[PDB]
Point group: D2
Chain length 121, copies 4
């Protein structure tokens, strides 16, 4: 993949969170995510996909379900965005966080936000 080498590795967001990803030649993303905010402790599995054949950014997305051996926040976040390489490489994303709720509370089950990931803290 064009940006396979650029994506693989460790990324940090504006809040302190870290994620470590391997991009496969087949478009796969696999790794772990460690949050700095919210009901999250330690690492969580992440999986996703990217465009392996894009001047344009490389579109990608991934999911974390917020369950590991220390916490279950009954929720999942998806990040959708694009990787931009270079000396100031970035993964710029928007995200959706859905919490498991009763049907009566489903209208308020999904938060939206944005994260910018860089190679340095």
């Amino acid at each position: 993949g064009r940006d396979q080498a650029g994506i693989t590795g460790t990324w940090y967001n504006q809040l302190g969170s870290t994620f470590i990803v391997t991009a496969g030649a087949d478009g796969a993303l696999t790794g772990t995510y460690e949050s700095a905010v919210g009901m999250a402790e330690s690492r969580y599995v992440l999986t996703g996909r990217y465009d392996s054949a894009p001047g344009s950014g490389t579109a990608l997305g991934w999911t974390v379900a917020w369950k590991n051996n220390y916490r279950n926040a009954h929720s999942a976040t998806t990040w959708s965005g694009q990787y931009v390489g270079g000396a100031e490489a970035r993964i710029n994303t928007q995200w959706l966080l859905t919490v498991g709720t009763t049907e009566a509370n489903a209208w308020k089950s999904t938060l939206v936000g944005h994260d910018t990931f860089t190679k340095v803290k």
Copy 2:
């Protein structure tokens, strides 16, 4: 997983699209997605995660990168939502679709929408 059996199988959205998923005991989602709208032909790989231990819905998300052996739309969609079981089982989602763009066009790179998936067409 509590809803592993409920999630695994074939789901249809309000637009005609189909997706087929296997939920693993470990929280993994793997399968294929076939769209009915947009720049999409045939099946695309999908991967995601769900809460394996939630009255509450089961939070989940998944990603499709819109590249296969017939099309490359240089884009990825993530769906975030919850599975609700029963006779009228549903996966209710919001989604984010990011297109790879130049930096100048990044402000207009992400679409948002919603899909409701059911077990019958």
Copy 3:
């Protein structure tokens, strides 16, 4: 405005909420919104804008701050969408609900959802 007459009046969403709007020739929307869900009782002021000169839908949006003489939920919702006329007229929207929070909690301050409004309940 092309759809001024079509927009002006009373609309109902899928949850029971009601809103009453006047569309001005100048692109203004003014009216009241009464919710069926959440921390809301009675009517709230709404204001917005629409495209007065669009086969295409008419783009529009409006805001409600959730403060009236009975409740203050320290929050505001914006709806963005389009009006489609005809025998089955609809206003199809996505919405963002932001709650006032401390800076530490700002990452979780905005909910996202969707509402479909029709002329009949």
Copy 4:
């Protein structure tokens, strides 16, 4: 309103755009928005609402329909967010931009993004 004086005036986003707003004691926002990106030239009317009685930010939102005497982009943007006062005052927002489309293209009618407004450029 607690933050009426703090909100009233001129704000600049990260892209260069400017908006000038008057906050009324009754929760009204009125003013003009001038974009730096997209199909926009000169000023457009904006209207919105804010929480006049919130440590917490002040929730607010507003709408711009992208029609003036120079351009009609057949679209409207809503911003939802919160005002935070102080020496580094900010209005932090998410936004939804809906374009008028045919029914067949409605699934791709709404863009999502974020803007941070400050009192200095």
